[PDB]
Design a protein around this ligand. Sequence first.
Ligand code: HEM
Length: 409
Amino acid sequence: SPNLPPGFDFTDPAIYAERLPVAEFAELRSAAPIWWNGQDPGKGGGFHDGGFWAITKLNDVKEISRHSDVFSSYENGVIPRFKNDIAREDIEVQRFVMLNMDAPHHTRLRKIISRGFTPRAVGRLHDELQERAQKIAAEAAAAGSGDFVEQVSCELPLQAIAGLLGVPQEDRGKLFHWSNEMTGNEDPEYAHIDPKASSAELIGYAMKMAEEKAKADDIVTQLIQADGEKLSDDEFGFFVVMLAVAGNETTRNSITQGMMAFAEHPDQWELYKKVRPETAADEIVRWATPVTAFQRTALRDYELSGVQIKKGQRVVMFYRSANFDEEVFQDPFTFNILRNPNPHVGFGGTGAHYCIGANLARMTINLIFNAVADHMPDLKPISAPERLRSGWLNGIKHWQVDYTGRLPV
Ligand code: HEM
């Protein structure tokens, strides 16, 4: 019996528009580490099953992640919150991306797409991203002050996707426009955006890219040629839509919130500026936990840590709670860029769906923080961050920063 308000719902977007429910997750870890989060009829974020099991401990997140025959991604998809009135068919179309597939379909697609994320493929992007990171941080610093989210955090993740896919320089503006429309839409600031339209345009663009690349040594060629497996044009289209969501706002929020952590822990920022430890990226992702939660649905009864999960019930893995698990991390509430080992689940629990982009993301994070250290070492915030209204993505919309640190306060 945890101490929470009547009807509290850990996927309620109205919570995340204002704060992370840190105290409430700590309460569950302590008192009810697997807890039934009931949901009133019509208040289930698109699911009409009465609620879900909140999973708060790291070991439980890993156990659910491993057992993908029991804990399905396909059955209800992995996003645990949409608009309450969403039609079921709009939840089910998510099954066209590999993140919402189970074996065998997932297994085939994962094996093919892994070609795009080899050490060689990712390292080939390094120098361009480093150069781009340097210019992003210089141009921002020269502006004196501005919105850190737009002027520092947004562009590099987009350029990492563009560089991975070999998107022509002239096509990057339109690619980025579509991609920025494809996630974060539950907030009134973005209420007028139609993600479905952008997703359709991206698919059309990507399918042509496949068409034409059949007509080189690059990731797109490798994906659409027999290894004997290959993506069809449409499988490529859905792979690109998946990246446009999986790898954009996530990395962006890691950058914003990693900078917010440095502002809050100036001794760590001083240490970072001197040492530039590559371990910083993992601590940044643990602290930022850009995906608050993903869900699964049990396909059979399963006893998890002494709790009887029943066939059909959803389990929601709160990576935001697991990443602060007092039994796993030493003093998880302090930000330590040298933390090592750092067994966080910000990229998922180990398992079939573990973030395929994780090394690309760490590289993007490390390059942008190097550039920030280089060009704006004295930065200070001007005002509090503005959070995103979403029941599953932990987002910062805007954050006004004085890059020079010279302004008062
Ligand atoms: C800090 C930034 C990022 C975070 C926090 C993040 C987090 C995650 C998480 C939690 C999952 C699901 C893991 C699971 O269910 O076990 C995932 C899957 C995925 N991520 Fe990332 N990710 C990030 C960056 C990226 C980037 C940069 C890319 C590619 C450009 C990417 C591509 C993908 C893909 C394609 C999947 C689906 C893999 C599958 O279902 O087999 N991610 N990510």
